[PDB]
Design a protein around this ligand. Structure first.
Ligand SMILES: COc1ccc2c(O[C@@H]3C[C@H]4C(=O)N[C@]5(C(=O)NS(=O)(=O)C6(C)CC6)C[C@H]5CC/C=C/C/C=C/[C@H](NC(=O)c5ccn(C)n5)C(=O)N4C3)cc(OC(C)C)nc2c1C
Ligand code: NA
Lengths: 182, 13
């Protein structure tokens, strides 16, 4: 205790570029959070109820490289900044948060687990302000309840003068509506 | 115009 995290790198520069072009990833997948990369950007994805969710501003319309070839997005909502792919085999699927605690954590690509106070449906305040450079590349990362269940994914940072005091996220609620709609 | 690629993962405890 409390909730902790660590990261493991699975691919280098060259392999990432090649896998990007082939759409074929034969690597073993593990963990609740995937670190994703495109040609130009890196960011996060969180697997919830068998779908790997991330931000449209990272992934765009792109396929995800997979064991059988490129995986087509099963959910794409541009205005909500949300996309999802069926989770590849091996990703650890998270449970949505029920209880409704307002005491949250944000897990960053650096595998830090940072206290957040939920201020509304889609917003939470960083209890200790962070430099924006620290949060960059963490979009798609999970916001968790104290139990470790997921409330949503990191979308955007509210920042001034290079410091972020709060975060906007996409609630698991928005995932179900997106699934219900399509 | 390529695919998104998994380059790493984070394991939660
Ligand atoms: C409130 O709704 C929002 C809010 C922001 C969105 C968006 O933001 C775009 C993308 C988004 C963003 O950068 N998200 C983050 C990020 O890490 N992106 S990233 O991983 O580096 C990336 C690059 C590769 C994807 C979490 C931020 C980290 C630090 C980044 C710090 C510096 C930039 C601050 C900015 N903050 C806001 O825009 C903001 C703060 C308060 N409000 C109301 N808006 C912001 O966070 N973003 C601008 C893109 C987008 O694209 C879609 C329309 C496809 N949709 C958004 C939506 C819907
Ligand atoms: Na850590």
């Amino acid at each position: 205790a409390p909730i902790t995290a660590y990261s493991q790198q699975t691919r280098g520069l060259l392999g990432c570029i090649i896998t990007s072009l082939t759409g074929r990833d034969k690597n073993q997948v593990d963990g609740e959070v995937q670190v994703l990369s495109t040609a130009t950007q890196s960011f996060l994805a969180t697997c919830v109820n068998g779908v790997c969710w991330t931000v449209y501003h990272g992934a765009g319309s792109k396929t995800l490289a997979g064991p059988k070839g490129p995986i087509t997005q099963m959910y794409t909502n541009v205005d909500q900044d949300l996309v999802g792919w069926p989770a590849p085999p091996g990703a650890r699927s998270m449970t949505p948060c029920t209880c409704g605690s307002s005491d949250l954590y944000l897990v960053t690509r650096h595998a830090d687990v940072i206290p957040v106070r939920r201020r509304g449906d889609s917003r939470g305040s960083l209890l200790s302000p962070r430099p924006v450079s620290y949060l960059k590349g963490s979009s798609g990362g999970p916001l968790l309840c104290p139990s470790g269940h997921v409330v949503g994914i990191f979308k955007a940072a509210v920042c001034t003068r290079g410091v972020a005091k709060a975060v906007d996220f996409i609630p698991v609620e928005s995932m179900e509506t997106t699934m219900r709609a399509s | 115009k390529g695919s998104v690629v998994i380059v790493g993962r984070i394991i939660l405890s």
